[PDB]
Design a protein around this ligand. Structure first.
Ligand code: HEM
Ligand code: HEM
Ligand code: HEM
Ligand SMILES: [Fe+2]
Ligand SMILES: [Fe+2]
Ligand SMILES: [Fe+2]
Ligand SMILES: [Fe+2]
Ligand SMILES: [Fe+2]
Ligand SMILES: [Fe+2]
Ligand SMILES: [Fe+2]
Ligand SMILES: [Fe+2]
Ligand SMILES: [Fe+2]
Ligand SMILES: [Fe+2]
Ligand SMILES: [Fe+2]
Ligand SMILES: [Fe+2]
Ligand SMILES: [Fe+2]
Ligand SMILES: [Fe+2]
Lengths: 158, 158, 158, 158, 158, 158, 158
């Protein structure tokens, strides 16, 4: 079914955001793993799979609307060298992605692409969950101190 | 069965205490949840359900004694902005409720409403359990320090 | 994540509606229970739990958006003294809450709070179900007469 | 296999009757459902599925005999506004369909289309069951009165 | 263990009340059974067993306290000839027994027979349940009318 | 609950589209079945049930909003005589229905009928799935040729 | 453990190859899915997961050897517009990656990084499997013709 062109560009831009998050979350996960911060590896990994699922949804949707999914262009990763910095970097990235999502959802509505919209509202809801997680971790770091926070990441949560 | 009027007023006043505790405990629970203090959310939540059960018992009793349960008037919530302050506020509230309970139990005895009394002694026993919990948490905060105490709330207790 | 201020006020106002319905439905339930109208106790009780779930969702959302959930202010209960009057009162309350919900959903859309909106559309759908139930019961009362209607509430529905 | 032409016209006319009954029974079912007459929704719904099965049989038979099933022409629905009127309308419709069935069965016999006949005798037997149901309900309405009859439809039959 | 004499007289008087209720409830049950009011037979029967359990408790207690249980004197039965009258008669009897129970509980307290008291408060709680049942049935009779009430007793409650 | 009048007209028009699709899909299914194209019978049949579910949802919604579901008027069926033509006809019909859906969804939003909207967005999502299926089949016919395509429909897909 | 620098550059270059293959295989998979070539979607998807596992292994190894995994630079995707072209493009990519792998394995040996080597020989073995698959499919296309080949991709392999 021939989709609206500008909807497809939004879908590709959103896809672009997910491709960045996939990589940044996966590296972060395995950095934590290497450092033995077992709990942060499990969570960041599971957020990486999340973004993968999101990318898949965009890709299928773009293809269905008869556009060309763009997996070639990869935006800026910002990795960071310590826990706080890296969590903070993931948070900034989610915030920028939520902004793009808000814009695309409004536009899909105005051209009547209600199913693209509905898929996007779902993804936003997942993002908003990732945002909540990061914000919470970052405040815990400050409330309990970095040393206690790190000790609390050594074992996986059952 | 037509109950003693003053017993019904006591039952409504006790109900009023429970309605306050229901709300204060539930908000507290979800504040802790938001902060990621998973363990305090589970406990405060389970104390909220507790007060709900208490309210239900009062409501059924009032109705049985042919009075009018009063769910319209809600006393002062005192929420607080940090863990200690909020736990302390729950403790003051339980202490005031135990006081009212002691008074009502004595009175139900003197007008021979032994089953109202028996229900109330049971509830008091549950309150006394909540009091124990709060007092213990508050002392732990001081003995181990706030930072260690907070770290200890991150995971739920199995 | 810092939410829009006016969205938070709407969320608190909606929360306020749920707190009223929680109490009015619960008292109604136990009044029916006392009268031995077993079936109406089961349904009204299950609608009380429903509103509780709604309140919880608002509370968590407000907290997530970094506002202060307001459980202190409780609007007017209208209890009533016989079945019809009480059902009718629940119906008026749902109708006013649906009105507030419609307004809040429109506003959340225009400030791009699509997830608050999505949660609210879900709640509205549940309300619309409660409305359907009350309207149906009220018509049954008239079609079959009060005496037959009452006899039909004595046993629980399997 | 090339069927007799007039048999195919009969099969299409019978199909036409079923298409009317499908719709009239389904709307009736959901009207009862809306009114909370749970038992009448279950029965009328199950009669709707019944007519659907009948339509399917005609369609397959017409196709097998190499004719063109006609699903385009839809006869007059007569919906009605209250229980009696609607049940009575379903009864008149079944009576007219049984008449057409009797005629078609005789004709299929005389051109030796014994399997079309055999399918039709089966369908007639089901119709005769629907007729029995409607007649019984309509007499119950008069014998026990409308109010008692309505109360008796509120719960589904196990 | 030698009990207080006046406690034993109270226990015998309470026992006397239970012996009356045992018989009155059992006859009532089987009257309802004979009339085909299956539901009232089940409930009144189960209240008869209840009073039997109460009698047993008094008997064991009196014996333990070294007194002589008195099963010889049987107070006035008031049977009645129709449903209302008979239910009303059971209600008056429970009311008189609750009065005696209230008096005995106060006295057991003042002579420090706390376990006799504790057993009696339990029994009172069961009586208060029987009172609730009778009051409810009697109001249902008036609210729905005798004819509808009777029809509602024909089948047992699952 | 009294719905917006124009929403009800949209719901009836959408219902009208579903009634057409129900019949066109069902005949198509049994045509394929007759031709021994087992796989296309299973898929088209399952799309017929799909439209039935959609019709049911509209009917219940219209009734809830207190309008009159219209099952009397049936739009133009376009059946076709060979596989391609028939698939193509189903595709044109879905495309026209999606158009009407897009329009109705926008309007329900502007009069605040958010639950009608939410139901409609769901249905659109199902339609968009049917569209995908038809488009894919039609391209497969061209890519692999009609003879190979037909052979591939002989067995059902596990 | 501080690894050899040039081994880390090889590991990053190999990682780079995997990141390209991940994306190219995933898009290819969902293109096939969209076209209804169910079997090629399953296989290409499962090769995408394969490359992901490979990337993960490189990432963990680089981190262990104390280098910086590079997920920022993405080489040229070559997508293609029809089955042959796309399969052929995957084949050229695997061939270039096998070449880089052969070179890296020899070098790891000469600096005594035997475990990096051992991981790489394993990955090469998987690549060599992908190469086999693509070569076989491409020959099948020629031996049986494109139309027959396409028909053979419609159903998934059990
Ligand atoms: C007003 C703020 C309240 C909130 C936010 C709230 C919330 C909740 C929640 C989330 C549940 C769990 C739902 C479930 O059982 O699956 C629950 C259960 C329950 N609530 Fe409330 N509630 C409130 C007030 C009340 C009031 C006024 C009553 C009346 C007495 C009440 C009585 C109950 C009872 C009896 C249960 C079931 C307990 C159980 O068996 O687990 N609640 N509530
Ligand atoms: C036009 C208004 C119609 C409505 C509202 C409607 C509705 C429904 C519904 C809700 C179901 C149950 C879905 C399920 O099986 O889970 C159903 C089943 C079915 N319908 Fe329809 N339908 C309609 C017309 C038709 C027509 C024209 C046919 C063609 C003969 C048909 C044939 C069938 C068949 C064969 C089943 C499955 C029966 C079974 O095995 O349970 N229906 N319908
Ligand atoms: C580029 C760096 C990537 C890495 C290191 C990576 C890694 C992984 C790993 C280790 C798994 C788990 C394997 C398993 O399921 O057993 C996985 C799963 C998956 N990946 Fe990736 N991946 C990457 C990129 C992508 C991309 C670009 C996509 C395309 C959308 C994608 C889509 C998926 C999907 C759909 C799953 C299965 C999710 C599930 O059902 O559990 N990934 N990935
Ligand atoms: Fe995402
Ligand atoms: Fe995210
Ligand atoms: Fe309490
Ligand atoms: Fe408490
Ligand atoms: Fe609600
Ligand atoms: Fe509600
Ligand atoms: Fe039929
Ligand atoms: Fe019929
Ligand atoms: Fe007793
Ligand atoms: Fe008793
Ligand atoms: Fe549909
Ligand atoms: Fe469709
Ligand atoms: Fe690989
Ligand atoms: Fe490979």
């Amino acid at each position: 079914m021939k989709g609206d062109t500008k909807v497809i560009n939004y879908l590709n831009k959103l896809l672009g955001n997910e491709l960045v998050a996939i990589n940044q979350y996966f590296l972060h996960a395995r950095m934590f793993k290497n450092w033995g911060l077992k709990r942060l590896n499990d969570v960041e990994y599971h957020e990486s799979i999340d973004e993968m699922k999101h990318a898949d949804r965009y890709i299928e949707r773009i293809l269905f609307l008869e556009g060309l999914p763009n997996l070639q262009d990869l935006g800026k990763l910002n990795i960071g060298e310590d826990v706080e910095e890296m969590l903070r970097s993931d948070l900034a990235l989610e915030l920028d992605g939520a902004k793009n999502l808000r814009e695309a959802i409004g536009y899909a509505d105005s051209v009547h692409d209600y199913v693209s919209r509905d898929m996007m509202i779902e993804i936003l809801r997942d993002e908003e969950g990732h945002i909540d997680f990061l914000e919470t971790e970052l405040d815990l770091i400050q409330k309990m101190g970095l040393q206690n926070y790190l000790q609390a990441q050594i074992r996986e949560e059952g």
